[PDB]
Amino acid sequence: ELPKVYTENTWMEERNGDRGMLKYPRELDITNVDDGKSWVWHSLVFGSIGRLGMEAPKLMGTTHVEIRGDFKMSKLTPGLKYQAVLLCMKTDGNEGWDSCPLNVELNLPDGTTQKREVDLTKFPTDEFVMMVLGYFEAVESGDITFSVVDTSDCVKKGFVVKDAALRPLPR
Amino acid sequence: GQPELYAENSWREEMTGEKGILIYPRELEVVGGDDDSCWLWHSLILESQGQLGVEVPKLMGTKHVEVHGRWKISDLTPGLKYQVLYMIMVEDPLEGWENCPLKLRVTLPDGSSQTQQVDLCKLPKGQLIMTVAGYFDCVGDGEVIFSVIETSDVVKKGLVIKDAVIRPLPP
Numbered sequence: 001e002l003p004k005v006y007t008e009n010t011w012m013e014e015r016n017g018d019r020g021m022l023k024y025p026r027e028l029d030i031t032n033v034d035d036g037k038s039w040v041w042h043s044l045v046f047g048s049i050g051r052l053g054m055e056a057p058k059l060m061g062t063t064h065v066e067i068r069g070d071f072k073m074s075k076l077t078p079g080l081k082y083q084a085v086l087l088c089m090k091t092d093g094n095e096g097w098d099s100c101p102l103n104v105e106l107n108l109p110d111g112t113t114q115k116r117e118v119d120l121t122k123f124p125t126d127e128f129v130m131m132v133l134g135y136f137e138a139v140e141s142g143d144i145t146f147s148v149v150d151t152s153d154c155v156k157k158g159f160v161v162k163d164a165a166l167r168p169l170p171r
Numbered sequence: 172g173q174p175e176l177y178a179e180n181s182w183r184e185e186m187t188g189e190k191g192i193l194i195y196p197r198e199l200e201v202v203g204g205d206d207d208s209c210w211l212w213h214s215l216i217l218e219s220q221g222q223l224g225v226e227v228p229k230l231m232g233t234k235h236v237e238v239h240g241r242w243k244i245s246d247l248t249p250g251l252k253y254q255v256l257y258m259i260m261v262e263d264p265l266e267g268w269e270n271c272p273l274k275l276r277v278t279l280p281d282g283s284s285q286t287q288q289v290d291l292c293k294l295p296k297g298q299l300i301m302t303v304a305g306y307f308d309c310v311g312d313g314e315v316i317f318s319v320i321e322t323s324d325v326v327k328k329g330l331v332i333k334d335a336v337i338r339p340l341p342p
Contacts (some may be wrong), residue, residue, distance in 0.1 A: 011299040024220040042176040050197030054224035
């Protein structure tokens with residue numbers, strides 16, 4: 001068993017001090033994720049040699065998909081433009097996505113809310129996608145929340161969550 | 172929490188489809204990486220999640236720091252500008268780095284090189300740090316090669332490599 005390096009869920013750009021942050025699935029609020037049926041926790045293994053897994057949930061079959069998370073503005077760089085993302089994957093054998101879009105919302109501390117509907121049939125199969133939750137410019141304080149939800153009658157299958165992140169625009 | 176899920180270490184931008192790559196350090200070429208007096212391999216932990224699924228090397232005391240990654244330019248999205256990153260961390264005990272900046276280098280198939288320098292003595296310890304190795308256009312064939320190097324005549328320790336990233340700069 002290996003010695004440990006401990007981390008924090010933020011990063012900073014060496015060139016200017018700009019900060020990002022992310023949350024892994026055990027830090028997200030996923031409804032019914034421990035019910036033994038709707039979701040099943042997998043060991044998600046990236047890489048080909050010296051492989052270790054991360055614990056990540058896979059959607060196994062439910063009509064109720066509800067994924068939520070939150071972030072502190074104060075951990076970001078004031079005045080910087082950010083993109084909010086959910087790193088997730090539609091897997092081989094997915095079901096129920098033909099007529100059920102995911103409803104995505106990003107809620108900002110000023111009370112504003114960005115909404116969009118995501119058609120998961122347009123995602124590639126078995127590769128992770130950076131799903132866009134929204135865009136904002138950071139301020140000094142406040143709570144950022146997001147939700148990715150569908151509770152329609154269609155039984156949904158085959159969707160993995162890796163992390164949610166607030167990243168500075170790539171440049 | 173036992174079923175394993177093997178996945179490609181990559182992502183696609185949602186709106187425009189561009190591909191990004193992550194390379195964990197077990198897939199890099201680490202000179203002396205099999206010698207525990209040079210590099211000692213650790214498991215990366217985030218307390219609130221558990222293991223992040225990455226074996227990361229920590230520099231233990233060697234004069235020769237040399238790490239290489241490589242990727243097929245033709246495996247990426249044609250015509251986009253790409254950025255190569257190294258995600259790193261420094262930790263106590265740090266030693267040997269005074270006035271010997273870590274050299275980051277990208278070399279292209281046409282033989283041209285871009286080198287950046289990072290003064291490790293100025294970084295905050297324990298923070299995950301995004302450093303930019305360079306930029307390239309995704310045209311033609313061949314391999315882009317991306318490295319971190321410090322081979323001055325002084326014993327160095329305290330550097331941790333989390334991964335390398337090749338990310339597109341999309342519209």
